[PDB]
Structure formats: C-alpha cells, structure tokens
Design a protein around this ligand. Sequence first.
Ligand SMILES: [Cl-]
Ligand SMILES: [Cl-]
Lengths: 360, 360
Amino acid sequence: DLLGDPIVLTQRLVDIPSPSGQEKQIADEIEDALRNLNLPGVEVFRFNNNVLARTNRGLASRVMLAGHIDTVPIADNLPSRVEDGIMYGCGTVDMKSGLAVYLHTFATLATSTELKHDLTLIAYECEEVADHLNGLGHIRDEHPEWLAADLALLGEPTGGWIEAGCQGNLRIKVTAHGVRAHSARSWLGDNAMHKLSPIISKVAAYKAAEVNIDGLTYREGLNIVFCESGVANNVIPDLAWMNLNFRFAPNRDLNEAIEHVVETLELDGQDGIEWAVEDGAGGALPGLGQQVTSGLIDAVGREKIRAKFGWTDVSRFSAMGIPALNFGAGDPSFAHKRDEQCPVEQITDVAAILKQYLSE
Amino acid sequence: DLLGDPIVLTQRLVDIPSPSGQEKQIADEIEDALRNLNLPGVEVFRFNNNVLARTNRGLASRVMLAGHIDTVPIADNLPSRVEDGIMYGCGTVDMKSGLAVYLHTFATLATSTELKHDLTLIAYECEEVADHLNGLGHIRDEHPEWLAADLALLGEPTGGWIEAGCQGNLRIKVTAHGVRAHSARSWLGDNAMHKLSPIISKVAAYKAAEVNIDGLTYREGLNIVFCESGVANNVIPDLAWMNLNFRFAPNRDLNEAIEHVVETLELDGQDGIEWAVEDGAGGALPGLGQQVTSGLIDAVGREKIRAKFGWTDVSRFSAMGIPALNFGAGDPSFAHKRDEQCPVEQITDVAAILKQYLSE
Ligand SMILES: [Cl-]
Ligand SMILES: [Cl-]
C-alpha cells in the first residue's frame, strides 16, 4: 500500500476484494500500511475490521475523514484495469476511490506543519448490510469518543461535488384489522381495507414540507410504498397493511419525525388500526455556516454544493452533534452497477481540494 | 333409479360419484330412467351431460325445475349411509337432494290429471366450475326455447325455505399507472398507489343502495376485495390495482350495474387510471306477486321466504325474463364441507310442498 500516490492506492484497494463480510484482508493491509509507516503523534486503532487513526496536534477545529472499505458482492468486476483516462472495476466509485483519497491525504498532512485541523480517519466495515453490522455503528456504541470532531466528511461518490448532510428516514407499517364476511353480505363483516381509506387520503393529499438550510433547500417525502390486502374475490378482507416512507429534513429528529407522521395521519385514535416503526434514522446537518467549514466551501465553490435527499452514514455523525457532508469521487451512478466507471481524473481533483482545505 | 320414492333416489344419486367433469354416468342413468319409464307426452332430451324433459298438456302457466347433477371434488364422503334420521355423504345437501326431489315430482305429476302447470325439468352439468362449462349456459346459448317457462325453481339447498331471486354480481379491476422514483425524491416520479386514494375514498364512503321487491328487501354491496401495490421500500410504485366487487339488486341489469359503478367512482376522466370488467352477471327477480307463484307461496308460508343476496344459476332464467326462486333441501351450510349433513326429513317435506303447489 503506497499512500504516497492517490490513483495507485485506488487501483490497489480495488484489486483487493472486499465484499461485505470479507473486508478482513483490505482492513489488515490498511492497518499495517499505517503502522509500519511510523507517523509520529498518529494513533492507530484496530476495531473489528475497522481502522481508526487520529492526530493530536492540539489545534482548534477537527475534521473527520470516514469511508467504508467494503463493497457490494463482486460481479466480474475484478481485477481492475484503467482504459485511457478512466478506471473500470468494482468499488472504483463506491468508496474505494474516496477511501484512497481520504487515506492518502491523512498519511501526508498528519505530520505537515501546515495542518490547520486535527484529523481523525475512520475506515469502517459492513456498510452494505443491515444496520446491525455497520462499522460506524459499533464504534458509536462502544467508542463514541473516536467519532468526536467539528466536521465530518464521508467519501461517498459525489463526483467531486459536495452533497451536504442528508435527510432523515422513517418507515412505518400501518395495519388495519376487520372481520371476514361474504362480499354479498358485506354488512355482516367489517372491511379492513376500507379502514385505510382516511389515512391513505391524508397521505395522498399531504404536501411535503420544505426547509432552507445554509443556502441549501431540503424537501421532504411522504409516500405509500407498499399496500397489500385481500384474501378472495368474494370475501371481505379482515386484514390490510401499508408501508409509509417518510423522509424528513435534518432539522427534525426521529422522535419529531415520528410524532409528525402520527399526528398528521391520526394513527392513534382510529379504532382497529395499529401502527409500528419498522426503521428509523436521523438526518444530518451540513453546518456550512461554520468557520470549521469555511475553507472547504472555498476549495469547491458555492455553486458545486447541493443537498443530499437520500440517507448516508453521514447521519451517524450528526447524531453525535457533528455537521457532516458527502464528498467523494466517481459519479453517484455506477453505484452498485456491474461496471463501476470512475474518471481517473476526479481521484486527484478531490485529493487536491482536500489539501487546499486542510492547509489554509 | 326409482323415481317412485324421494329419499331412496337421493341416496341413489349420491352413491353415483359425479364430481365436475365426470357427471357422465349419473347423467346417463337419469336419461335412461326417464326413457325406459315411458311417460306419454313427456319429451326427453340429451344435451352433453344435461338431461332435459318437458310436458305439453297445453295448460296456462309453466314451471321450470332445474338443478345441477355435479358436485365438488369428493373427499372421503362416498358412499353414503343414513344415521338415524339424517343422511351423511357428498352432495346430499348440494343439489343431489333437491335433484332427487325435482326428479321424483316430475316423474309423478307428468301424467297426473291434476297438474296445474306444464313442467320442464333440467338436470344440468358442470355448475361447479367457470361459467364456460355451465350446463344451463350452453342450453341458453344453443337451445334457449327449452328454458322457456313462467316460473323457475332451483334445487339449491335452502333447508325447505324459499330464497327468492338473487343479486347481480360485478367485479371490476381498477388499475392506476404512475412512474418509478426513489422515495426520497418522490417528486421526480408519480406515486401510482396515491392515485387510487380518491376512488378508494368514494368506495369506503359509499352506502349500499337498498330496494324492496314483493315484500322482500334486497341490499347491495360495494367492497374492495383485493388491493396490491409496491415494489420496494425506497421506490415510488408505478403500478397499483384493485378489485371492486359490486352486488346489485335484481332491479338492475349488468349494463346498469356497470354504469352505476363507473359514474359513482368516476372511473372515466381520472388520468392514469384504467378499469375493466373481469366478471359480470345478472340478478334474478322472484316475481312472488304473480299468480303463477301464488300456490307455492301458500305451500311454504309467507314467513319462510327471504331474499337471496348471493348469486345462483337462478339468474340465467331471469335473464330470459323468467322469475326464479331457490328452493331445495339440506342446510345452506355443509355446502362444500367435507361432511354434508342432510336431515332425511326435509327430502319428503320439499317433495310434499311441490305436490301441493303443482296440484292446486
Ligand atoms: Cl440525493
Ligand atoms: Cl344469501
């Protein structure tokens, strides 16, 4: 592992197969590439298949550099080979590029006297699987102190752009109960499916709330994504359920997001209707209006920064009270596509931006 | 085959296995039991596995006696054995009782000088299967003249009661089309499922119309019986469909029933929504207020006659412009139950009622 060059490290990390669960090797290499390379003041920490590292140069602000080392199950995309200006392979866009960059820059500026911000580097595992294996997850649960920082940056592929923060994510399953009866004697029973009619109506009528933050504009989303009901053409259904997916702006927290959905749809009070949260997640504030961030906005340009409507591990930091942004290489597409295309150029563009940000 | 006794014929017809498609034998026996028994003026007609027979004694009114000779697939219910006042077996309640009765009475009164009404007897096949194999169906299609009568009686199990007419049956499949999009960017797409919200609301708000006929009261039914939509928790569904089941009073015909549903739910005009009829069927008027029926009402009692909310082949006659009633033996339950229980008594009760009706 070089760490002396950005593009080489990428093609090096990509050629090391790391589909979720088997990040063992790529993790071990990164640890040893940092240890055998004896950077003074730099602390290396091995936690499962996560690799943490931090400097303690006193210093005012602190920047977090995080990225996942795992990939989606490989599909004839390894090893990698560069084809005239562009690198094809697996992971070239999903982190392994940004990861190479986040690693490279930390290896260099850790001992550079012109480092304006303390650095933490977290290369974590199992991002591509249920939130009970997530590397950042266990870290937050056992060693939260390591997450501490004044700004967090996630290597997620953004094509050199800054996709600031992320929106909260809430999935609720609304279930209506009735009683079976022959569809010709409907009155003898109670149509469960019809009970969702009022709740459905409010959802289809709901106009998503919208909020401005740091010059950015986040828009919410409330949609029915699953609706299943029925047992026979001549039987009044006694059971009907839905899946509501609520995407809330980073100015809300789960408890608020939940309370908003439950109040607006009147999930409590409606007889025969039960609801429950199947998945919840916090949003992420970009905090662009802070000095800790000033430099980075400049090294990228105010007109290359949009809001992230999706959800990334960026929230795990914002939960800790840490502003976070998505900043990586490769087009957001080719994400899990069986032909990840990453313009070899963006690798150096990003690495350049980071130095300008962390040196001014 | 006796035809000299009602209860014997029943236990005889039951012991002859006739699950849909194999009514061959039971059909052949009935034909030959009528032919070799040379009733003068009586015409016997063999059509597929249906057995028709009619008298032509001039006479004013004419009564139709119809019943299906087939059963639901047998399930350890044959042969049959009577257990102290009650007969257990397969078909003992689903027609084979009424069929025995309808046969018996036709064999007797066909040459009796005290027969007030001309008689047609139709013992048809494949009632227990899609309406493209139905015996009465093909008869109506090729030899409608045989269905001609002033009153029709179906041997369906009603436990000696008269279940008058039947309600129409309409199933429409409403389908909404949208466009896929990430549930966090819902605005980029169009939620198909939300498009059914207005139509669903009208259905859940619709109060079924209700009509009185001949002292009887029919109530309609409009219910969603199937609702399926969704492709992923993070994907705006582009496709959503429903199954509406409309049960209309016998004062409406299919074209009216359809037009009522389509107007009330505004199925035309709503953009992105297509609808289609999957199944339709006419209702059946009881016509109890007619002289042709006078006798039968008396031989049963005005307080043993209720309205049939379901649907029976009784409609196939009412379509021909012929009032029709459901009058059979055995409890309406035990219908397709793996233990058909028919009180051996009701066999003679019904046969008695019929004579009193057809002799006065
Ligand atoms: Cl996004
Ligand atoms: Cl009924």
